[PDB]
């Protein structure tokens, strides 16, 4: 704890303005990034399943520049596939939810940044308290585990040269496809 | 550090998007490529006009003389260029670190 | 994921996101009363 507690103070000294708004090495950011990582692994699993079961129509078909304009073009005179464009559109939905939630939050919900004179939540430590149910503890447990999972899965793909979907699919035992 | 990052970028872009390997086979005829163009304001006619340098994507031709220099001094492959780029990334970081250190 | 995708991902970020975040940060910095 002494190593971590000191590291937080160092970051707070370097970036007081950011740390005061819950940005950077904070419990605020830990939790929020945990939530996204948890949703993220579901989205990856759903992508692997949707691709396998043929939910996305004309997946490998390339988009037309006449219809969709210049943004379909990629680096080396390659065009974006329907599959990739579709997955992007799925993310645009929840990005716009995010922007709404951030700027215009519900009265009851957790807010993105800390209030003018709000302190941070106390760090959980090496192991948080094990409290079963819809608790801040259980959220932080699953959030930390998810973010570890994303780190591992990404790291595995580059090191081994396999696709993230292949790694995830083999990790689940060839269930998705 | 900025000088070394700039040199790194020149090496990297030529390694990745250039035609150095083709150029050395006919240096007085082939035009050397600086880097690729990606600009969504381009119409189709401009994409075609900038895609006349052997390769299948729009590019800028280099007038910096880097290809001529690199060929003279013994570079022959994109892997030579790439490792050069990697090396100069590390040197940039080293100078950056020395900058920080000498204010401690 | 391939490398030919990179310009289409990166150029919008370096051109339409990075500058506007930088401009916003600089604006906040220069207006702070402290």
């Amino acid at each position: 704890l002494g190593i971590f507690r000191q590291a937080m103070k160092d970051f707070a000294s370097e970036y007081p303005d950011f740390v005061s708004r819950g940005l950077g090495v904070t419990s605020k950011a830990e939790r929020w990034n945990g939530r996204h990582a948890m949703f993220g692994l579901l989205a990856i699993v759903l992508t692997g399943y949707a691709k396998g079961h043929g939910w996305i129509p004309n997946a490998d078909q390339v988009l037309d520049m006449q219809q969709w304009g210049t943004l379909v073009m990629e680096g080396f005179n390659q065009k974006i596939t329907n599959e990739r464009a579709i997955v992007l559109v799925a993310h645009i939905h929840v990005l716009l939810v995010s922007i709404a939630a951030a700027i215009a939050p519900f009265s009851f919900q957790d807010r993105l940044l800390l209030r003018p004179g709000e302190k941070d939540e106390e760090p959980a430590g090496l192991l948080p308290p094990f409290k079963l149910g819809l608790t801040k503890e259980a959220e932080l447990w699953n959030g930390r585990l998810a973010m570890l999972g994303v780190t591992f899965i990404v790291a595995t793909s580059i090191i081994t040269g396999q696709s993230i979907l292949d790694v995830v699919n083999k990790g689940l035992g060839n269930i998705l496809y | 550090a900025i000088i070394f990052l700039w040199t790194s970028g020149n090496l990297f872009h030529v390694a990745w998007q250039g035609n150095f390997e083709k150029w050395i086979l006919n240096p007085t005829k082939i035009k050397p490529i600086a880097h690729a163009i990606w600009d969504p304001h381009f119409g189709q006619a401009a994409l075609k006009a900038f895609s006349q340098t052997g390769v299948d994507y729009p590019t800028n031709i280099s007038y910096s003389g880097l290809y001529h220099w690199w060929y003279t001094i013994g570079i022959r492959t994109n892997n030579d260029l790439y490792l050069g780029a990697l090396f100069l990334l590390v040197i940039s970081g080293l100078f950056l670190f020395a900058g920080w250190l000498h204010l401690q | 994921m391939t490398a030919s995708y990179l310009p289409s991902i990166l150029v919008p970020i370096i051109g339409l996101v990075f500058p506007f975040i930088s401009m916003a940060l600089f604006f906040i910095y220069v207006e702070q009363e402290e």
């Binding site: 370097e14 580059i158 040269g161 | 550090a1 990052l5 990297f12 390694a15 990745w16 390997e21 492959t77 994109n78 892997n79 790439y82 780029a85 990697l86 990334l89 590390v90 940039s92 970081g93 950056l96 670190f97 900058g99 920080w100 204010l103 401690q104 | 994921m1 391939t2 490398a3 990179l6």
Partner: peptide
């Protein structure tokens, strides 16, 4: 010639000057 793997190694390595630049910038 140059692989996706090689381009990702470059991008990862470019984080080192990025972070160090941040540190130098702050210290100045």
């Amino acid at each position: 010639m140059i692989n996706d793997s090689q381009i990702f190694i470059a991008l990862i390595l470019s984080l080192v000057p990025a972070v160090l630049a941040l540190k130098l910038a702050r210290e100045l």
